[model samples]
Every structure is written in structure tokens, then in C-alpha cells.
Target chain A: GFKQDIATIRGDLRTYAQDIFLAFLNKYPDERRYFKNYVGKSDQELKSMAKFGDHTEKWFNLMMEVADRATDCVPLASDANTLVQMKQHSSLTTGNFEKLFVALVEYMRASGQSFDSQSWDRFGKNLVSALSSAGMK
Target chain B: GFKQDIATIRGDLRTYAQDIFLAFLNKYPDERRYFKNYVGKSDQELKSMAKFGDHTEKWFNLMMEVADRATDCVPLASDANTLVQMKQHSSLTTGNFEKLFVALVEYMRASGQSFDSQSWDRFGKNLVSALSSAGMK
Candidate 1:
């Protein structure tokens, strides 16, 4: 069901990424400081910046790729490594990552997209399990 | 842009219709009275009934068809006739139709679909103009 819903809006993935990033910032404006280069820039300015676009694009791609793979009910080794690396390299807390997922779910609901809660619950649990194995508390 | 966005979600058009109908009802519960056959049913029950499904599907198809045609920048004669017939035959107010457009725009935005506001403005104006030409005030 999640995959089907994702397929439905595949054409707008780029815009969706942009919107989600904005939504994430909207909910957690303080989090903008996490992006050293993005700090102090207005939302409109950030959107026009290539670096911002690229960052959001990459994030969206990774998310979709992981989600697509997730349907097979197995977390890919590549995804696991990436998650571990992200935790190691960034100042992001596990809480921040969880908030992003909350933002995404809210965004989808706001947009009238139907999704199964149980499916998302499973995905979240699997992701947490992967992160826990990688030493995240 | 609207056409491209519509194309992306073509596979879920049926579900999209169902969601939009539910959204419309959610916002204006009193409007449910217009669907005399559907009144008194719970939202979940309404969703499972064939009559409700068929009604929502036809409405969604018509809206999509009109939106697709609107891209040509010219309103079609058939669409005009349909609008006229709907106004003549239904208890739907001009306000109700306007609210449905609001609901749709809100729905699309919530779903992360990008659309040009000027495009929607033009479409709305054209629809009103068509209805006016058919003697609706």
C-alpha cells in the first residue's frame, strides 16, 4: 500500500522533496541550524540555492530507495551502512530522524494521500531495529 | 504541470476520488444530505457501498476530464453542457461547487503535488464564465 501510494505521486518526487524539507523546517525552525551552509537563509532563498536542492534531492532519493527496498521486507546492507554513516558523521539525533518521519506522515495526510498506519509502524520498527544494531541508543 | 501531476497518480485515481469525496464530507458534513441515498451511513460504510464508489468515481473522472481539457486553454462545449445540467438538476449551490474546488486544491497541496495558482485561477474563471453563459448567476 505504501509502495502503491508512492507510485501514485512519483512524477512529483522533486517537488515533494522540496515541500517536505520546507515542512520539516517549518515544524522545527531551530533545526535549520543543522545545515551550516543553510543557516540564516530565508526559505525562499534556500529553495533557489542549488546546494539546498541537491541535498533535498539526495535525501529524497535515499528515502525512496530504502522504502522501495523495504517492501521486500529486508533492509539492504547498503542502507544499513548509510544509516550508520549518517549517524556517525552528523550532529543529528535519533530524535531528529524520527521527527522527519513524523513530518512526512503529516505531509502525506495533509495532501489527502491514504496510507496504512500498520505498514508505517512496521517500517519504523524495522528502521529502529537497524539503527539499534548499528549502536544507536 | 497539472496534467503531469495528474498522470503520475493515474493508477490511484479511484482511491484519489474516494479520498476527495471523504474530504468534502469531512469539511462540510451538512452537505452529506445532498447524497440522500448515502445519508445516515458511517464514513466507512459509505466507502464500501457500490453506489457511493460509483458516484465518486464518475465525479473524479469528470473532474479529471475537464481538468485535462482545460490544459488546451479552451473550455469544451460538452463540459459546458455538463455544468449546465448539473446546476439545473442538482440542489448544489454555486457556493458548494466553489467549495469543492477549494477542497481539491487543498487536497492536492496536502499530497505534495505542485500546481500553478494562476492556472487554477484561469480554470475557475473559465468555468464560472461557462456557467454564466448558460444563465447561472
Candidate 2:
């Protein structure tokens, strides 16, 4: 069920990517400072920027990777590896990763998309457990 | 800054208590099942019900207690004590607590209230650490 849900979102990857990214930025406006290339740009301008598109695409790809591993009942080994690399390279906190998933779910609800709460709970538990085990928090 | 922010919210405690509770329910509709007394009631009807008001007020009081402890830089001994008791008596998971704070911040933002992220971060970190130390998750 969660796999199909994720696939449905991924099928419209471009639109969902930008929508989820904007939702995150809207909820945590202070975090906008992280996007140096998008500084001083209006929301409309951000949608048209190449760097913005690239960043959102990268984020969506990472989410896809995590969801695939989660749905396949794999050990989150690759997901943890990628997240650990991002954590080492960036100033992002463990809380930021938590907020991203919050924003994603909020976006899904606002857009009238359907999801199985039980499946989502399982996915979240596995991901968070994996992150904690990797010492990212 | 966060202390003052919390005080501002507490000043309008009655209104904020209901607002935050409704916001949480709106975001997680499935959680509505937990409030058996409020079942089949309209949002407007909920405000008139004693059980709903009592539950929301209890939640607000807990938040105020936690804020006071967090702002004072004291160990979260009392806050942890209360939370641990609740955990031991309920089926609530740690994620439910996390979602409540998320809903709180979301409500604050939507209501045009202001808060310092640094102070909020400290509050969250300390509270979460206390919960973990108390063996609540």
C-alpha cells in the first residue's frame, strides 16, 4: 500500500517535488537561508530557478530511495549511508530531516492525496530507527 | 524569546488551548478516535462540551509546566515525572508527543505569533532528552 502510494507521488515527480519543497520552505521560512542561490528571490522566481529545481529534484530522489528500501523491507542500509553522507557534509540538524517528512505529509493531505496511516507509521518508525542507529541524531 | 512567546500564548490560555487541540485533530483526523466523548460532535459542538474543554485545558497546563521548566534552565525533573506517568498509563506513543509539538508550532505560526527558533530548539531538546532518560522512548 505504501509502495503504491509512493509510486503515485513519484509518477508526478516534478510537480510533487516542487510542491513538497515549497511546503517545507513555507513552514520553516527561516530555513530559506540555506539556499544561498535562491536568496532574495520571490516564491514565483524560485520555481523558475535552475538551482531550485536541482535541489528539489535531489531531495525527491533521496526520498524515493528511502521509500523504496522501506517498502521492499530492506535494511535501510543504503538509505542510512546516503543520509549519513548528507549529514556529514551539511549544517542540517536531525530535526530538519524530521521536518521534511512533516512537510511531505502535510503537502499530501493538503493536496487530497490518499495514504495508509499504518504503512506510513511503519515507514517512519523504520527510518527514524535507522537514523538513530547510524548516530545521526 | 521563547519564554515570552509561551507566556503570550498562556495569557490567552482558553482560546489557545482549544485552538491547538482542534489544530492537532485537524491534522491527524485518525486521532479523533481517542476522544470518545467528542465523537459525532461538530467542531462547534466540541467547544461546548465539558469533556473537550477539560482535556484541552489539561494539555495546555502540561505545556505551560514544561515551558516554565525549560525557560528556567532547571532540570526537567518534574516535567519528566508527569510525562512518564502519562506514558505508563496510556497507549500513546512517543511520536504522538512529537506530533503535538509540531501542531503547537504550526498553530503559533498560523496565528501570527512569533518565537525564537534557538529557544524553541533548546526547549525541545531538553524535553526530549528528559523523556528518553525517563525510559519513555
Candidate 3:
């Protein structure tokens, strides 16, 4: 089941995070604006993300620092299936938390199901707001 | 065991991407940026993604659009393992496709390993330069 795949993938990354998180985190340096722009690179891409903010582009690509070798997670040929799942999942994962978002996609895919988009936003808006606020607490 | 787990997770996301690869690709109007950022409340996100190089931020919460209920892809506690795996992957994912550099850390972790900050940064500098040359292919 898709959920099983989730079980398999999630713990491995979390444990990996316990062993790996702090190392890459130092790259962000607690600088907010740079962090904001750097956060954009968290998605994947260079020119625009590195250059997203009004400020001069000076950000580090977190992924290159964190998982490339530890996991050796690479993009596969168009025919590969599971690799794609991890790519999608990894795209959402920031610091070894529960990859709440990517799990949804993989779950849907695993079940051979499909989904709509907007409602996903309302939910995410609520969650992200909550997470951000909780970060305040 | 870690290699097995990483391979499994990577393959899963790849399949998800492949499933949506075609219709998954929305046409854009004039998006010249390397990475696109967008959020949607209704059909707007899809439209923007179609013509503006955007994917609904709704896709963020793992898509809650199916039945007004957030779907399973959003990370079920039962599926904690995969979710965490994805989360960590995000940290490693870089803009220039620098998978090797990030993989280095994953390599350390899977082997019950670690690295100092200087060693990490030096690796990162090399990785970034290597990745920069990658997109040219």
C-alpha cells in the first residue's frame, strides 16, 4: 500500500536526519532575508531561486549539502517509478520532519488515485500558518 | 539496509512524477525563471501553473483537492517512515542537480557517520561547482 511505502521511507529519513540535520542547517546561518531566498532554493533550481529576492543572490543549495551522497538519491530515467516518489517526497522535506505534503501525493499514487488542487491549498495554508505560528511559541 | 530503503523511497516518488508527467505538465505563458513558485485557492493555481510556470502551492499539503478532504499523501502518522525520508531528501535536493554532493552526507549517515562544518563546506563548494556545470548537458 502507499501507506506502507510511507512507513518504509519516513523512518529512514528521520533517523538519517538525527544523524545528519545539524550539518546542513548551518548553511542557512539564521539570516532571515537570505534565509527566505534560500528557502526558495529548498524547492529545487538555481538562477531564479538563488536570485528570487530583491537582494543580491547569496544562498547555498541545502540539498547539495544534505542528501546527495548520504542517500545518493538521484533523478532516474523517465521509466523509473519509485525514484520519482522519493524526488517528490524529498522536494517537500526540509529538515527531517514528517514530509506531510509529499506523503499525500505518494499515497494517492500508491492507491492509483488522483486528486484536486485548491482544497489542498486551504489545508496547507492552515498548516503552514500553524507551523509558522507554533514556531513562535 | 539503508541502501535498500533509499532505493525504495526514491523509486516511489519517481513513479508519482511519471504518472503525472504529461498532463502533469502545465503549459506556461512567459515563465523564464528556472524555478516557479505559486499558490492557488481555486482553478487559479492550475491556470497560473498552466500559463505562468506555476504549480499550486496547494500541491504543498500533498493535495487536498480530491473530496474536500485532504488526501493520504499528506503524511499519515501510520506512514511516518516514508514521510521523514522525503523530508530529509528535500534538504539534500539542490538546484543544479548536485545529487552526489548531498549524497555524501547520506553516505556518512547510512554508515553511522558524520562530518565537521569545514569539511562539509569544502565539499559543498566543490559540489556546487560540479552541479553548475551539470545543467549545461
Q: Which model, 1 or 3, shows the larger DockQ?
A: 1
> How far off is residue A51 in model 2, in Å?
46
- In model 2, pairs of residues that clash are none
Tens-digit lDDT track for model 3 on A24-112? Answer: 23222222222333431222232234233222211112222222222222212221222224432333322222233333333334343
| Candidate 1 structure quality by residue, lDDT tens digits, B1-137 | 65675565465787888887876765555566577766435456677799888878888787778878874545676786687677433555456766676666666666765655455556666776666676555
DockQ of 3: 0.02
Place model 1 in a CAPRI quality band: incorrect
Model 2 alpha-carbon miss at residue A37, Å: 50
Q: State the displacement of the C-alpha of residue B4, model 1, in Å, after optimal TM-score superposition.
A: 31
- Candidate 3 at A38: error in angstroms? 30
Candidate closest to the true structure, highest TM-score: 2
Candidate 2: segments with Cα more than 4 A from true spot? A1-137, B71-75, B87-89
Predicted model with the maximum lDDT: 2
2 against 3, candidate with superior lDDT: 2
Give the Å error, residue B48, model 1.
25
**Which regions of candidate 1 fall more than 4 Å away from where they truly are?**
A72-74, A115-118, B1-137
